[PDB]
């Protein structure tokens with residue numbers, strides 16, 4: 001009996017916004033875990049909409065704070081042999097990818113292990129090896145990376161040199177809420193020093209996919225899966241899904257569209273839940289009311305221009321707090 005945990009992260013003003021003299025309409029209070037939105041513009045200076053969350057990160061939050069506070073507890077439950085999912089949800093430009101992946105600091109000032117701008121994926125891989133090596137247990141780590149665009153499936157770590165070769169998806173007859181990704185390459189990570197070269201190749205395939213399909217970065221969903229096998233004889237198996245969704249400001253929007261419908265259906269206790277109607281909600285079905293521990297990172301902008309999309313994100317995120325999973 002475990003509810004889905006949801007956090008909110010507000011980014012600082014960007015440069016376009018500073019030049020346009022944007023006003024803030026967001027107040028993020030981490031102590032009381034509240035986000036408050038100024039909704040009345042020039043007409044009603046006093047009206048607000050306020051939501052309470054499991055945690056709230058204001059503009060000044062460092063990447064390392066997201067990792068320590070959110071990723072470590074989940075990583076520990078993966079090392080204990082459970083299934084866990086984290087996805088970033090919010091409008092384009094609000095920090096979904098900065099949170100899940102991060103950036104490299106310019107001028108080559110840092111190693112990739114120490115860069116303060118790295119996000120969840122690079123820290124998770126480095127720290128899995130740190131925790132288990134010189135910890136006394138036998139383990140193998142494998143990772144995969146598929147992407148969803150226009151309800152087609154692409155393998156961004158595949159040995160094939162053409163990124164456009166499509167994957168295919170079938171119900172898993174071994175697990176009642178799972179899928180099989182026919183064709184998906186799973187690459188073994190032998191140690192921490194292999195982590196960066198694997199990311200490099202996936203980044204290169206992503207760049208080429210951008211030249212082939214319209215608005216690729218913002219209309220595709222990203223699913224980075226790491227699986228851990230541990231032998232202590234007692235052998236546990238953990239799996240962690242790290243998902244970066246497409247922009248929530250929306251043929252093409254089918255997974256995003258269904259995802260809301262699926263959420264509304266679970267929290268309204270409707271009988272039939274339309275998991276089957278999109279590729280995304282099929283992959284994530286054990287993560288939306290199944291037996292997987294799930295956490296949502298909802299990203300938003302402080303600027304007045306984005307009032308409607310900020311409200312839309314908060315309401316979707318707040319409503320998903322009412323969904324229960326039953327992990328292992």
Ligand SMILES: CON(C)C(=O)N1N=C(c2cc(F)ccc2F)S[C@@]1(CCCN)c1ccccc1
Nearest residue numbers: 101102103104112115118121122199200202203
């Ligand atoms: C240019 O060199 N490369 C390959 C990188 O810088 N990275 N590769 C990443 C990555 C790639 C994927 F295909 C899938 C998932 C991922 F997380 S993470 C990232 C940043 C990527 C841009 N957001 C990074 C690592 C370490 C410190 C700071 C940033």
Ligand SMILES: Nc1ncnc2c1ncn2[C@@H]1O[C@H](COP(=O)(O)OP(=O)(O)O)[C@@H](O)[C@H]1O
Nearest residue numbers: 010011012091092093094095096097098099299
């Ligand atoms: N939390 C943050 N702190 C500082 N800068 C951020 C933050 N989140 C996003 N940004 C900046 O905003 C830009 C867009 O963020 P990104 O993650 O690419 O958006 P999306 O939500 O579309 O993936 C990036 O260039 C990044 O530098």
Ligand SMILES: [Mg+2]
Nearest residue numbers: 096097217218
């Ligand atoms: Mg993006």
